[PDB]
Amino acid sequence: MKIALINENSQASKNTIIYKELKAVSDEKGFEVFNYGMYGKEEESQLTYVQNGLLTAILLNSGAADFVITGCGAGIGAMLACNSFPGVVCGFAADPVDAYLFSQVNGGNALSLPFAKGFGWGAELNLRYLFERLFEDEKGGGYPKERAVPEQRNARILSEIKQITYRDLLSVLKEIDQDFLKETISGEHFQEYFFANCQNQNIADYLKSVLD
Amino acid sequence: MKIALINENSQASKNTIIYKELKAVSDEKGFEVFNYGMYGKEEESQLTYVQNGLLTAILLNSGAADFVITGCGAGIGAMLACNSFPGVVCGFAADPVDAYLFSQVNGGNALSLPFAKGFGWGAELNLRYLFERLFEDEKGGGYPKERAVPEQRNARILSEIKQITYRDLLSVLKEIDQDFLKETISGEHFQEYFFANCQNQNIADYLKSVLDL
Amino acid sequence: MKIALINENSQASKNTIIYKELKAVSDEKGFEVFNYGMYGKEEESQLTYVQNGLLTAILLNSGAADFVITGCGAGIGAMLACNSFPGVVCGFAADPVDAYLFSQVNGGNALSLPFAKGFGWGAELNLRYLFERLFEDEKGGGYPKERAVPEQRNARILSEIKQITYRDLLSVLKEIDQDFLKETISGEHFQEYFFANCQNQNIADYLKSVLDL
Amino acid sequence: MKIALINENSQASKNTIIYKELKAVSDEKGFEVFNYGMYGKEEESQLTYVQNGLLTAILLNSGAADFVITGCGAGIGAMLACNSFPGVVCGFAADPVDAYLFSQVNGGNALSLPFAKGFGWGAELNLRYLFERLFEDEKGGGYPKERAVPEQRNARILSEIKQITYRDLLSVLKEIDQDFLKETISGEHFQEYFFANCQNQNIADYLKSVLD
Numbered sequence: 028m029k030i031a032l033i034n035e036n037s038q039a040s041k042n043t044i045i046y047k048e049l050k051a052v053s054d055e056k057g058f059e060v061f062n063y064g065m066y067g068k069e070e071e072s073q074l075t076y077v078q079n080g081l082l083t084a085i086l087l088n089s090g091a092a093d094f095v096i097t098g099c100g101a102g103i104g105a106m107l108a109c110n111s112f113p114g115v116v117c118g119f120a121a122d123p124v125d126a127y128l129f130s131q132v133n134g135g136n137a138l139s140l141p142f143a144k145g146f147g148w149g150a151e152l153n154l155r156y157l158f159e160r161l162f163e164d165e166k167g168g169g170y171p172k173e174r175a176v177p178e179q180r181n182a183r184i185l186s187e188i189k190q191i192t193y194r195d196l197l198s199v200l201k202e203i204d205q206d207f208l209k210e211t212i213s214g215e216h217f218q219e220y221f222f223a224n225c226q227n228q229n230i231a232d233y234l235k236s237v238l239d
Numbered sequence: 240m241k242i243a244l245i246n247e248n249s250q251a252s253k254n255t256i257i258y259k260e261l262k263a264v265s266d267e268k269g270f271e272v273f274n275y276g277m278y279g280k281e282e283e284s285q286l287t288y289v290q291n292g293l294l295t296a297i298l299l300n301s302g303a304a305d306f307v308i309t310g311c312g313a314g315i316g317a318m319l320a321c322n323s324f325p326g327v328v329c330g331f332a333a334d335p336v337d338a339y340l341f342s343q344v345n346g347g348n349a350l351s352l353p354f355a356k357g358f359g360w361g362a363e364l365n366l367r368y369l370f371e372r373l374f375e376d377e378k379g380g381g382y383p384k385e386r387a388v389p390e391q392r393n394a395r396i397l398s399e400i401k402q403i404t405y406r407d408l409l410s411v412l413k414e415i416d417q418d419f420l421k422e423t424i425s426g427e428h429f430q431e432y433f434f435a436n437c438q439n440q441n442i443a444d445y446l447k448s449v450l451d452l
Numbered sequence: 453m454k455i456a457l458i459n460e461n462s463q464a465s466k467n468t469i470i471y472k473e474l475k476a477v478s479d480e481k482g483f484e485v486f487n488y489g490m491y492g493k494e495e496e497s498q499l500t501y502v503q504n505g506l507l508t509a510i511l512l513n514s515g516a517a518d519f520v521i522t523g524c525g526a527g528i529g530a531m532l533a534c535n536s537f538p539g540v541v542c543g544f545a546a547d548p549v550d551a552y553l554f555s556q557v558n559g560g561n562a563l564s565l566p567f568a569k570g571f572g573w574g575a576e577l578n579l580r581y582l583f584e585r586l587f588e589d590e591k592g593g594g595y596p597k598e599r600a601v602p603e604q605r606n607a608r609i610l611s612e613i614k615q616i617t618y619r620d621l622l623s624v625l626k627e628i629d630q631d632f633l634k635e636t637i638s639g640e641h642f643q644e645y646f647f648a649n650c651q652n653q654n655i656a657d658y659l660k661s662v663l664d665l
Numbered sequence: 666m667k668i669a670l671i672n673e674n675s676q677a678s679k680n681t682i683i684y685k686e687l688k689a690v691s692d693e694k695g696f697e698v699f700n701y702g703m704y705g706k707e708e709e710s711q712l713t714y715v716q717n718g719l720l721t722a723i724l725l726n727s728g729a730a731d732f733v734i735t736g737c738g739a740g741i742g743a744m745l746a747c748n749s750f751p752g753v754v755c756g757f758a759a760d761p762v763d764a765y766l767f768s769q770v771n772g773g774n775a776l777s778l779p780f781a782k783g784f785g786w787g788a789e790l791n792l793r794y795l796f797e798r799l800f801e802d803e804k805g806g807g808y809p810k811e812r813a814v815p816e817q818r819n820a821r822i823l824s825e826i827k828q829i830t831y832r833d834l835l836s837v838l839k840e841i842d843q844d845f846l847k848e849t850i851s852g853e854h855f856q857e858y859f860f861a862n863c864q865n866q867n868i869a870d871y872l873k874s875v876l877d
Contacts (some may be wrong), residue, residue, distance in 0.1 A: 037386070075389075077396050100386075101340045104328050107347070108397060110322040113405050119331045122760055123794050124787045128313045128356065134317070144340060147575070148525050148568035149762045149808070152572055155762050160794070170787070174249070177287075180318075184419075185289050185320055191414045192323050194406055202403050207396075217363050289779070312786050334547055335581055336574040355786035360738055361549040361595065368548055368581070392492065463810070493876070497675050500815075502823050526766045528697040528756050529816075531772070533823055536830050543741050544757045553739045553782060560745070569766065600739075602713075609845075610746060615875050617749050619832055627829045632822075 028058040028162075029224060031092035033083060035099050038142035040064035044151050047144070049096060051137035052158040057178050061092065061220045071215070072098045078211045080108025080115075080234035081203070085234070086214070087136050088114040088196050096158075099138035113193035116185075121145060122153065126161040127170070134167030197229055209237055240270045241436060243304035245295060247288045247311050249276035252352035256363050257354070260344025261308060264370040273304065273432045284425040292327075293415070293423045297446070299348050300326040300408050302438030308370075310352035318351035325405035328397075333357065334365065338373040339382075345389050346379030412445055421449055453483045454649060456507060456517035460501045462525050464490035469576050470567070472523060486517065486645045497638040505533025505540075506628070506636045507554040510659070511535075513539040513621050515651030523565035531564035538618035542609075544569065547578065548641035550588040552595075557603050559592030568643050625658055634662055666696040666800075667728035667862060671721060673714045673737050677703035682789050683780070687734060690796040699730065699858045709853070716849045718746025718753075719841070722873070723850070725774050726752040726834050727785035728864035734796075744777035751831035754823075759783060760791065764799040765808070768817050772805030779792035835867055847875055 035064055046062050053060040063082065065074055074082065076099040078208045086092040093226065095117075102119050109117035114206045116135030121124045129138060140154075167182065169175020200208060212221075212234060225231045244261055246254045258274050265272045277286055277292065286294065286309040298304040307329075311317045314331055321329035328347030332338040334344065341350060350373065352366070382388025412420060424433070424446060437443045457474055461465045462585035471487050480484045483603025488507065490499055499507065501524040511517040518544075524530045527544055541560030545551040554563060563586065565579070592607065627635060637646070637659060650656045672680045674787060683871055684700050691698040699766075701720065703712055712720065714737040724730040731757075737743045740757050754773030758764045776799065778792075805820065807813020838846060850872060853868035863869045 060412060075393050076394070077393050077400060079402070080397075101337070101344055103341060103345050104390075104393065104397075106318075106331070107328060107345065108324065108400070110319065111397065111401050113404070116319060119318065122791075124356065124790050125313070125315075127790060128787055129315055133315055133319060141572075143573040144336065144571055145570045145575075147571040148566075149766055150572075152765060155758075156794070156798070159320065171248070181287050181289050181316065185292075185316075185323065188293075188320075188415065189323050192325070192406060192411050194404055196864050199404050203400065228322060334578075336577050339577060340574055353786075357783045358785040359779075359783055359788075360781040361553055362783075364549050364552060364585075365547075368585070372577075372581070459775065476773065500819050500822070502819050503825075504827065508825075526763070526770060528763075528767055528771055529819065529823075531744075531757065532771060533753060533826075534874070535745065538830070541745060544744070546759060549782065550739070557739055558741050558745065568760065569809050598841060603742075606713050606715050606742065609713070610718075610742075610749065613715060613719070613746070613841065614749050617832055617837050621831060622747050628826065 031061045033097040035074045036063045039173040041066040048072035048155040072213045077108045079105045083109045084112035089230045095137040100143035102141035103137045123156040123160040126157040131170040242306045243273045245309040247286045288316035289320045291317045291424045295321045296324035301442045303436040304366040307349040312355035314351045314353035330440045335368040335372040338369040343382040350395040455519045456486045458522040459490045460499045465492040473580040501529035503636045504530045504534045508534045509537035514655045516649040520562040525568035527564045527566035548581040548585040551582040556595040666731045671735040672703045673712045677705040686793040710851045714742035715746045717743045721747045722750035727868045729862040733775040738781035740777045740779035748791045761794040761798040764795040769808040
């Protein structure tokens with residue numbers, strides 16, 4: 028499993044804290060983790076929570092990541108942005124139970140977290156704990172076993188609906204503001220991490236044209 | 240201001256509890272509440288959290304409701320479904336601060352709530368409290384107050400993105416499974432509440448054909 | 453009704469934030485607030501969460517305060533210390549429902565709050581909200597309303613038990629370390645607020661001797 | 666380590682749920698667990714949250730248990746009762762971070778939990794998680810390492826204060842309402858669990874006189 032972390036500008040100062048706990052859990056489970064930033068450095072490439080959504084969509088649809096951790100001050104903004112794109116099912120979580128339930132009931136491929144609201148003393152413990160529960164069992168197993176069938180059926184039906192409600196992703200990439208897109212993919216490690224792990228040749232080709 | 244309440248099957252038994260608090264807050268504020276069910280009534284028309292999303296999209300895009308309260312066991316399913324349609328900005332709230340921040344930071348038109356996870360003693364008080372905070376101040380004012388401009392800008396940019404990413408709702412209604420759509424709008428009070436409050440004649444006309452006049 | 457606010461050293465920087473919200477709620481309700489610090493003032497007299505407990509006991513038993521708001525990083529330390537003295541019933545609250553339930557189920561005279569754990573964006577809103585719910589209804593009314601009698605009975609039985617389990621406060625004040633006690637009452641405004649509001653002359657007389665008149 | 670579970674009447678119906686998760690964590694860690702009830706059975710011996718406090722005090726002061734898990738609807742009542750007796754330091758916890766912080770910052774010997782407020786779907790997951798974090802590290806280690814010294818010093822000072830503020834426990838047992846005391850120790854398994862694990866001969870002797 029490949030996991031990506033994405034931070035926007037308001038919470039960039041917490042990227043090191045967040046990645047430390049995410050990497051700890053990933054290392055133990057033998058997953059691969061990629062820190063796409065923001066990193067909390069002066070003069071670095073900037074992302075808004077809206078751009079977090081676009082980047083999340085790019086990473087997941089290309090196969091460069093299997094799961095994306097992101098968020099913002101209260102976590103709702105990033106959630107809304109992520110869920111504005113095809114091929115993204117982005118939850119919200121505040122505690123470890125939330126994370127386990129997201130994994131088993133929804134089985135999505137992204138999670139948006141609050142990095143300011145409720146984020147104080149011991150917040151990094153909460154991060155470690157929720158990451159552990161998020162990846163405790165294989166996703167989409169249902170909770171409890173008695174409600175597993177309707178939960179999984181509903182998740183499938185949702186996926187089918189999303190095939191109808193969203194426009195083609197590459198079409199979206201071509202039609203959105205190109206300066207907005209260029210900035211979203213201007214991170215110091217984007218090219219290194221993305222093109223090495225991208226499985227979607229069509230997305231790769233277009234982003235290459237945007238970059239050179 | 241017209242508020243719609245929508246429950247799916249697993250939490251239908253809590254519809255009366257939720258409605259009581261939503262109605263209390265709305266009456267104090269002079270808002271209208273339309274309870275679209277489910278009602279926790281034996282043999283009633285059924286909704287899944289996915290159908291909650293579709294119904295939410297129909298009510299908001301048509302103008303039949305200005306705000307939608309919905310949810311499910313943990314609240315995430317309904318959030319995911321609501322946000323899969325154009326014209327819907329659906330948050331999540333576990334406490335009253337969450338609801339206030341949603342109103343100020345995001346300024347959306349729907350909120351999905353957990354009706355089972357964390358729902359015990361005083362959960363009805365939490366509902367009342369969060370409904371109060373949700374409608375305490377004019378939406379979109381920003382928090383922290385100093386982050387108002389970038390928050391307002393980002394919410395606008397989000398809308399710009401959504402204009403590109405979603406297909407037109409009317410096309411969606413024609414492309415989705417029609418039995419699924421018909422069930423979604425088969426509630427006992429749907430026709431009464433919807434057609435009296437709908438502001439979009441194109442959506443109204445299409446749904447009439449789905450229901451066979 | 454007189455409310456005292458007490459902060460220890462680790463959360464002293466948040467005293468102004470907490471006071472702002474407590475004062476706002478108290479002003480609306482017509483309550484008096486006495487900020488006993490710590491204030492987040494360089495070189496000020498220091499309190500640990502243990503001393504918060506002792507000060508809370510002094511203020512409540514003397515009648516100088518009717519209710520005490522205190523806390524620490526996670527709120528548990530101060531709770532443990534407050535509840536180690538007679539005449540103190542100190543709850544804990546993380547959200548506004550917690551505060552309402554404390555008022556109705558326990559009907560205590562102190563509340564310890566987490567000022568660091570979970571304390572981020574909107575935490576000052578949570579404070580305001582919980583203070584409002586804490587003083588919303590007459591204390592001890594019970595929740596659920598049907599559990600009022602056994603809750604009221606159990607609270608009374610708890611008091612009966614405490615009459616047996618604790619030593620007299622005046623004896624405690626004489627037996628504890630006197631430097632520790634003196635520091636606890638060395639705040640810049642302690643003498644002003646305490647002696648003007650104290651209703652127990654025996655406690656007043658003893659503390660005067662500790663402070664050397 | 667010996668862990669005891671105590672439930673009062675309002676939450677007795679959840680004893681099986683609570684004990685299942687507590688036993689799971691105890692079994693994994695090789696601790697010993699004792700279910701003192703209430704068990705949620707018809708016509709069983711009854712406990713109020715106040716009696717939970719007295720029983721907690723008896724178990725901890727006698728050495729029959731090293732740690733006590735208890736609670737009530739909102740958890741505050743049981744906390745107040747437990748902290749009304751010498752030799753008991755009873756925390757409160759709502760989430761797993763709370764439990765870890767209680768262990769490291771306070772290092773007490775009892776924890777009171779809410780079994781009704783916030784106790785819904787997935788509540789048993791929260792119980793398992795918080796029990797795991799409660800016993801993750803040896804108690805009183807401090808959090809973070811930078812605040813460990815003042816935290817541990819303050820916990821010691823609190824213990825010293827408690828030596829002064831509380832009356833002698835055996836004196837308390839003799840002076841409280843004896844019907845109240847008798848009921849508190851009338852549970853079906855009390856004699857079996859208590860006298861086998863009691864290290865305080867003076868408490869054992871007096872309770873024997875109360876029972877026969």
